[PDB]
Amino acid sequence: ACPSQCSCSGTEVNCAGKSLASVPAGIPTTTRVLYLNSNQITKLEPGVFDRLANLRELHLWGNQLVSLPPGVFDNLANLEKLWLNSNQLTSLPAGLFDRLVNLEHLGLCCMKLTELPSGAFDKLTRLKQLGLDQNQLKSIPDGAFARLPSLTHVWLHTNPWDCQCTDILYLSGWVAQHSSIVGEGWPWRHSPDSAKCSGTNTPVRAVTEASTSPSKC
Amino acid sequence: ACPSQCSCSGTEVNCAGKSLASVPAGIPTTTRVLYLNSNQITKLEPGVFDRLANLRELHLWGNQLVSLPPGVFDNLANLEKLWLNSNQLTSLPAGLFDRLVNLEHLGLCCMKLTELPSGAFDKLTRLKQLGLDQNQLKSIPDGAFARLPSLTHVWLHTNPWDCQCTDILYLSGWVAQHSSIVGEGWPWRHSPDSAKCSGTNTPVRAVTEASTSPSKCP
Amino acid sequence: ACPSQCSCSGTEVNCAGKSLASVPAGIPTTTRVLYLNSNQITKLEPGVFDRLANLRELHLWGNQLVSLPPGVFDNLANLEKLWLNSNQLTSLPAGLFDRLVNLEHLGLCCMKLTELPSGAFDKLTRLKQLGLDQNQLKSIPDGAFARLPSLTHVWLHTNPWDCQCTDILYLSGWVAQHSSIVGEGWPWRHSPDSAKCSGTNTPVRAVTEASTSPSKCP
Amino acid sequence: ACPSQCSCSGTEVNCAGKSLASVPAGIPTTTRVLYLNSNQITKLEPGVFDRLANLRELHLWGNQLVSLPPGVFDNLANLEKLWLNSNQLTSLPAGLFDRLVNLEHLGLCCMKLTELPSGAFDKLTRLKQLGLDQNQLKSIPDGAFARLPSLTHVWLHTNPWDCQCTDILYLSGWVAQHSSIVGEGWPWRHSPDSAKCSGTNTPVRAVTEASTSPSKC
Numbered sequence: 121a122c123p124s125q126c127s128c129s130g131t132e133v134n135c136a137g138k139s140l141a142s143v144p145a146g147i148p149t150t151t152r153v154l155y156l157n158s159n160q161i162t163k164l165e166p167g168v169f170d171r172l173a174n175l176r177e178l179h180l181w182g183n184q185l186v187s188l189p190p191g192v193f194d195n196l197a198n199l200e201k202l203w204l205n206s207n208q209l210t211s212l213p214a215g216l217f218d219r220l221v222n223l224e225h226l227g228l229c230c231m232k233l234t235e236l237p238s239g240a241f242d243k244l245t246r247l248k249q250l251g252l253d254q255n256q257l258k259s260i261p262d263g264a265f266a267r268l269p270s271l272t273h274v275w276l277h278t279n280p281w282d283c284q285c286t287d288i289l290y291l292s293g294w295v296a297q298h299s300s301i302v303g304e305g306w307p308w309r310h311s312p313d314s315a316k317c318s319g320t321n322t323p324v325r326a327v328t329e330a331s332t333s334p335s336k337c
Numbered sequence: 338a339c340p341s342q343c344s345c346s347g348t349e350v351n352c353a354g355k356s357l358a359s360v361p362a363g364i365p366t367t368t369r370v371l372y373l374n375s376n377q378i379t380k381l382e383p384g385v386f387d388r389l390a391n392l393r394e395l396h397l398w399g400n401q402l403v404s405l406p407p408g409v410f411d412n413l414a415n416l417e418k419l420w421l422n423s424n425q426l427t428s429l430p431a432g433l434f435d436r437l438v439n440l441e442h443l444g445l446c447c448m449k450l451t452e453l454p455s456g457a458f459d460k461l462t463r464l465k466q467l468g469l470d471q472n473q474l475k476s477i478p479d480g481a482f483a484r485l486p487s488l489t490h491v492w493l494h495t496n497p498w499d500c501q502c503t504d505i506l507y508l509s510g511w512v513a514q515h516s517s518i519v520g521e522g523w524p525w526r527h528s529p530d531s532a533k534c535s536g537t538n539t540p541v542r543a544v545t546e547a548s549t550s551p552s553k554c555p
Numbered sequence: 556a557c558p559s560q561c562s563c564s565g566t567e568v569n570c571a572g573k574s575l576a577s578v579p580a581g582i583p584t585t586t587r588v589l590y591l592n593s594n595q596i597t598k599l600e601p602g603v604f605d606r607l608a609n610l611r612e613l614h615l616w617g618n619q620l621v622s623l624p625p626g627v628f629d630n631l632a633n634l635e636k637l638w639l640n641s642n643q644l645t646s647l648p649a650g651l652f653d654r655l656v657n658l659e660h661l662g663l664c665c666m667k668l669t670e671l672p673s674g675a676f677d678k679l680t681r682l683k684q685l686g687l688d689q690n691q692l693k694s695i696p697d698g699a700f701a702r703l704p705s706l707t708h709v710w711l712h713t714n715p716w717d718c719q720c721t722d723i724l725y726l727s728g729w730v731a732q733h734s735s736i737v738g739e740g741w742p743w744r745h746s747p748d749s750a751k752c753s754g755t756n757t758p759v760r761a762v763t764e765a766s767t768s769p770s771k772c773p
Numbered sequence: 774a775c776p777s778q779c780s781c782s783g784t785e786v787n788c789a790g791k792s793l794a795s796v797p798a799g800i801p802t803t804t805r806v807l808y809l810n811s812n813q814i815t816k817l818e819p820g821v822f823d824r825l826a827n828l829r830e831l832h833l834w835g836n837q838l839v840s841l842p843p844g845v846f847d848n849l850a851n852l853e854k855l856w857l858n859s860n861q862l863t864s865l866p867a868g869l870f871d872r873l874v875n876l877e878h879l880g881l882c883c884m885k886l887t888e889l890p891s892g893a894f895d896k897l898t899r900l901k902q903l904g905l906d907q908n909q910l911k912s913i914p915d916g917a918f919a920r921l922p923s924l925t926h927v928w929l930h931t932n933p934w935d936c937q938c939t940d941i942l943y944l945s946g947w948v949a950q951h952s953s954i955v956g957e958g959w960p961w962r963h964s965p966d967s968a969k970c971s972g973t974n975t976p977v978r979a980v981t982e983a984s985t986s987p988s989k990c
């Protein structure tokens with residue numbers, strides 16, 4: 121029972137590039153792949169996806185979202201790919217991704233993220249690809265990647281990483297350890313020195329405790 | 338065990354856009370996603386994918402392939418997406434897709450295909466999306482789509498369909514009966530009149546046997 | 556005199572990517588390069604650029620403009636580059652570029668243009684690069700490019716050219732004659748067959764009147 | 774007589790992204806805009822550009838150049854834009870830019886520059902924009918910018934400025950005095966405190982003489 125603005129066949133619903141200001145009503149409950157990208161959507165109602173439990177791929181990139189409701193994805197237990205790139209988010213609510221236990225790809229690039237909440241990714245045991253590039257992050261909270269045992273590809277470049285603050289040391293030691301999975305481009309290419317210290321141009325992985333201080337935090 | 342030209346982490350190997358003239362040796366057996374697109378590969382050796390039984394997605398688009406070896410995909414029983422868009426193929430060998438019983442997406446657009454072999458798609462019981470747009474096809478062999486029970490999206494536009502010839506009548510009847518799945522664009526948009534007759538720019542789905550003739554076949 | 560929203564030094568004013576809904580007030584009259592791309596502008600107020608006669612480069616790309624007022628560019632006698640790529644325009648008003656006699660680059664790609672007004676480019680004696688790719692154009696009005704004596708680079712691909720209709724023949728003879736300037740990509744790469752007939756996949760330069768009809772002109 | 778690898782129409786030659794190891798022969802003498810970016814060029818042949826006296830724009834960014842011949846630009850009297858971003862240069866030879874008297878844009882970012890020759894920019898009376906960000910620079914020679922009367926935009930961020938050493942005082946006083954033109958981004962955004970001290974992450978323009986010592990240099 122397709123939204124008039126969209127095309128629907130099978131389990132795919134394509135509403136992309138239709139100048140929409142909100143998520144249309146009447147997206148079928150059988151939908152598995154939902155394209156809402158490249159619109160002008162300015163917010164998501166809490167509840168807007170409560171009925172779309174069969175989603176595996178959700179494309180929200182290229183909209184104008186400025187925050188997300190904390191429980192907006194809680195019913196999407198089948199979700200495998202989530203693309204939020206190129207919105208205007210500055211933060212993510214605690215618990216946003218907690219129910220997404222089958223998620224394998226998460227695109228967060230090209231926003232204004234300035235921090236991530238501790239535990240943001242703790243439930244994502246299946247996550248393989250995480251894009252955090254081209255945001256405004258200055259550090260990653262301690263242990264933010266410790267429960268991502270499936271991660272094989274991460275993008276961290278093009279952030280203003282603050283390597284003067286002792287807060288960097290989780291990320292420096294993590295990239296040093298996991299350098300094989302740090303890269304850039306689409307599809308991913310290996311690029312472990314692409315996370316750079318915004319002040320000094322030193323690779324994040326090369327930062328040492330002795331050069332940092334808590335008073336620069 | 339990555340070829341030096343490529344990047345490899347986890348089960349993905351990215352050799353895209355590396356000016357490669359052939360598929361590099363040493364792609365790991367555990368590979369699931371393999372990007373070979375946007376190179377200068379002009380032929381594939383038989384056997385090249387024989388070790389890569391774990392592949393789920395194989396991207397061969399944007400090369401200069403002018404033929405495919407007949408059994409080149411025979412060991413890829415797990416394959417779900419195969420993209421051959423934008424190569425230079427004019428035909429496909431009989432049997433080529435027979436082993437791809439789990440294939441869900443097949444991209445053949447933007448080549449020079451002038452015909453498809455009879456039975457090309459008969460084994461693809463799980464196929465969902467089939468792209469045949471932007472080729473040089475004039476008709477579809479009788480019963481070509483009869484064993485595609487999973488098909489939900491097909492692209493047939495931008496081909497010079499020959500609507501004078503009796504051979505068009507399978508495709509015309511087919512499009513009429515499956516109009517909900519025929520479209521255009523990426524991702525797909527609904528467009529059932531987008532398969533058009535070369536001589537009149539009339540929709541293919543409107544053709545009836547009253548206007549076709551066996552003597553108008555080339 | 557910098558708008559608070561933007562950065563200004565020299566004769567360059569950068570208001571790009573600032574989530575703007577309108578052209579900010581007080582852009583200094585000395586401005587030569589104005590970046591207003593990648594915002595949320597849906598319309599322009601008539602007069603908006605009347606004080607900015609010193610502009611040489613105007614960047615409007617990546618907004619959501621739905622139309623342009625007919626004399627919005629009339630005072631920009633110094634303009635050399637004008638970029639309107641990736642807006643939502645479906646047409647252009649008569650005379651819109653008439654005053655832009657020093658224009659050298661004009662980007663009109665990736666919109667929804669369904670036609671070009673007659674005489675749209677007739678005053679653009681210095682135009683060198685013209686991007687019309689990725690629109691909804693079906694044909695070019697007879698003689699539309701006759702007065703572009705400095706044109707060296709044109710992009711015409713990704714439009715649904717209607718080669719069944721007799722009206723295509725201006726454009727087919729023109730691309731045939733000027734094939735060395737037809738291309739794709741940024742920066743431009745040579746690609747003379749990239750303008751294709753939407754119905755048949757024949758290159759537009761290859762079309763002749765043996766295959767067209769005046770009765771097939773919707 | 775267009776090189777086989779390239780596309781040429783009018784006065785523009787596009788040889789970008791073609792795996793070239795050298796500049797191809799047969800670039801026309803009438804060429805005004807030359808794209809050689811994004812190739813595999815590690816060195817240029819002496820004289821390679823001597824015939825190309827009509828160039829206005831020369832894109833060399835994204836190669837792997839390790840050095841430049843001192844006279845390689847000498848015949849380019851009409852050059853207005855010169856992009857060398859993202860090569861591997863560590864130094865520049867004396868007088869490299871001396872003949873480029875019409876140059877308006879000069880891109881030197883994203884390399885490995887560890888110093889600039891004094892006098893490097895002394896002939897660039899028309900230079901408007903100068904990108905020096907993302908290198909390894911520790912200071913700027915006394916009077917380096919004194920003959921850049923047209924400069925309106927300079928990027929100095931992401932370099933490890935040594936603010937202990939008295940050699941910084943030319944740059945700190947210059948940035949304090951020309952703070953209106955110091956910025957970041959593409960296109961330029963105003964960011965006067967984006968030049969930062971290596972050991973403190975404090976702004977280079979806030980450096981006092983009392984905090985320095987000629988000893989560390």
Ligand SMILES: OC[C@H]1O[C@@H](O)[C@H](O)[C@@H](O)[C@H]1O
Nearest residue numbers: 227229250251253275305306
């Ligand atoms: O998976 C995330 C990746 O997504 C792409 O869309 C993006 O260009 C990359 O920069 C990276 O973020």
Ligand SMILES: OC[C@H]1O[C@@H](O)[C@H](O)[C@@H](O)[C@H]1O
Nearest residue numbers: 444446467468469470492523
């Ligand atoms: O999956 C088939 C589709 O694939 C896209 O890559 C292509 O641009 C479409 O026109 C269609 O062929």
Ligand SMILES: OC[C@H]1O[C@@H](O)[C@H](O)[C@@H](O)[C@H]1O
Nearest residue numbers: 661662664685686710740741
């Ligand atoms: O001059 C117009 C050109 O503008 C570019 O931004 C675009 O990618 C090209 O496709 C072409 O239209």
Ligand SMILES: OC[C@H]1O[C@@H](O)[C@H](O)[C@@H](O)[C@H]1O
Nearest residue numbers: 879880882904905906928959
């Ligand atoms: O003119 C130089 C400028 O060039 C851009 O290409 C680069 O992103 C900037 O960071 C700045 O250096």
